[PDB]
Each structure stands twice: as structure tokens, then as C-alpha cells.
Amino acid sequence: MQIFVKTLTGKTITLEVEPSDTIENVKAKIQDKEGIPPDQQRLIFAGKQLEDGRTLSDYNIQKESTLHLVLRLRG
């Protein structure tokens, strides 16, 4: 299924995922597209920061859901 991950600057990253994918698997896919390591990523759905060991379905994330990605970068 497709999900959309939006960013601060308005970019949209589309991902092909399974409902049983973990958050960590999702972060890995984003690293494949965008080159950001999972440790620098926080994913947000409905205002909740999503934890690595849980699955999309635990969060009620469905076909064509939209999430946001915020960055945790050491400055």
C-alpha cells in the first residue's frame, strides 16, 4: 500500500509499505529515498511520535495515510 510522508519544507515522500511494517522499516525506506539515517528521523501520525518497534497497523495507519517526518539533527 502507499503512504505519504510530509516534511517541514512541504516535500512529500511516497513509500510502498505493508500494514504489518514496523516504524523502523518505514524509517529504513525513507533512508533509501532521501538518505537520512533512521536515528535522525521522528515520524508523527495524528500528533503521536511513532515508536520504532510498533507496526503501522498498531497506529491505525492505513492505505494512503499521511504522516509527517521531523528531523533530530545534532547541531
Binding site: 510530509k6 516534511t7 517541514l8 519544507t9 512541504g10 516535500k11 532521501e34 537520512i36 535522525q40 508523527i44 509527517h68 517526518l69 521531523v70 528531523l71 533530530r72 539533527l73 545534532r74 547541531g75
Partner: protein
């Protein structure tokens, strides 16, 4: 040359609003918290009054060629400390923000108050060395924890309104950058958000490594 007298190492700080909140408290200041903007133009009426923004971006050498203001208000109105070492940027950005607050919800606390009182009439570069060598400030900073030339360093800067102007406080510079005049009935945040969008145009549409936070009254 001033960096030669800088003592101790400073860690890098993750762009996390919980951490910047705890740093404000660790410095002794009360009344404020830090909230992350998830999208650059998201609705922020519920955040107001916003006391300042903290913006993180990957520093590009073209920043050196930025044209800056020669406005008199930059000299007369704004507190500014210039960095003497690179890794202090998170604390330097935050203290540049806080030392420009005058607001009934803000209490700097005795540490930052006396620091401001001591450094207020010093040159910005000396203000910076004083910050860098403060064991109290360095301790708080490090408890939460790279060549510019290679453009792989993430930098923290601060946006703050002072009087009728809005300022970008970037501690690599020798002075604040006055971005423009707000109001009398305008919204200062629009001037800051415009500047942040202008900086973002320095990059390709495939740069996504940014973070934006608002320093707001605690809730």
C-alpha cells in the same frame, strides 16, 4: 584568535524541543517552553505569543556572501554574543534569544540576569568568550549532548523581535542581521518565516534536513 582562550569542549545538541526546554530551565530561566513546528507555515495562533524561533539548517559557504543591514537599531537595541567556538551554537542561539526578552511571562533567573548585566556593555566577541568560558552554562549544555568548509555542519540560529524590528541572531556573524521593520499592526513572525524561506531557497528542493522550533510561554 579569541578561540585560543576558550576552555573546555562543547558537545553537539540534537534539534529536539524537549531538550531546548530543559536547557532553558537548566540555565535558571522560567516561564517558557519550546514547541516544534512540524510544517513551516502551519497554524501557530495557539502558540502565541511566540518569543522567538530557533532554526537549524546545514550551513553553506554562500552564507558568507549574505548582504547585511547597516541600520542604527542593530547597534542600539539588540543584545548579541558572537560564537568563539563552533560547538556552542545551540546554547549561543538560545542565550541570544533569551537575553532579548522583556515580557511579563519571562524570568531569566539570577544566572542569566547577572550574565546579561555583566556582558551587556561588552563587545559581542567578548560576550561570546564569556559565554564559552562559563562553567555553569557549559555544564548545562553538555549534560544534553565537523568542518564548515565541507558544508556538513548543522547550525542553530535565532529569530527575535526587538522594538519595531525583527532580527536573525546567527552567532557566526559579528552582529545581528536586521531583517526588516514590522507592524504597527503587523505580525513579527511573518518577517522571520520569510527569512527562513529565503534561506531554504539556497538549497535544492531535495534538501530536507531542517528543524524549526518556537520558544513560547509555558502552558
Amino acid at each position: 584568535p579569541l578561540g585560543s582562550m576558550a576552555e573546555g569542549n562543547w558537545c553537539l545538541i540534537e534539534s529536539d524541543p524537549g531538550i531546548f526546554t530543559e536547557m532553558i530551565h537548566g540555565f535558571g530561566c522560567t516561564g517558557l517552553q519550546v514547541e516544534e513546528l512540524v510544517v513551516l507555515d502551519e497554524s501557530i495562533e495557539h502558540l502565541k505569543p511566540i518569543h522567538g524561533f530557533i532554526f537549524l539548517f546545514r550551513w553553506l559557504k554562500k552564507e558568507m556572501r549574505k548582504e547585511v543591514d547597516d541600520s542604527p537599531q542593530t547597534c542600539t537595541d539588540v543584545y548579541f554574543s558572537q560564537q568563539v567556538i563552533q560547538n556552542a551554537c545551540a546554547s549561543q542561539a538560545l542565550i541570544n534569544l533569551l537575553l532579548n526578552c522583556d515580557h511579563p511571562d519571562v524570568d531569566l533567573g539570577p544566572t542569566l540576569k547577572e550574565f546579561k548585566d555583566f556582558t551587556y556593555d561588552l563587545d559581542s566577541a567578548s560576550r561570546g568568550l564569556c559565554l564559552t568560558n562559563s562553567e555553569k552554562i557549559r555544564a548545562v549544555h553538555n549534560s544534553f549532548g565537523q568542518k564548515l568548509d565541507e558544508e556538513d555542519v548543522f547550525h542553530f540560529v535565532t529569530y527575535v523581535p526587538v522594538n519595531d524590528g525583527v532580527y536573525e541572531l546567527d552567532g557566526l556573524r559579528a552582529a545581528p542581521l536586521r531583517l526588516g521593520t514590522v507592524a504597527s499592526d503587523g505580525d513579527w513572525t511573518e518577517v522571520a518565516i520569510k527569512a527562513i524561506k529565503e534561506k531554504i531557497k539556497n538549497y535544492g528542493e531535495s534538501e530536507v534536513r531542517f528543524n524549526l522550533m518556537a520558544v513560547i510561554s509555558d502552558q
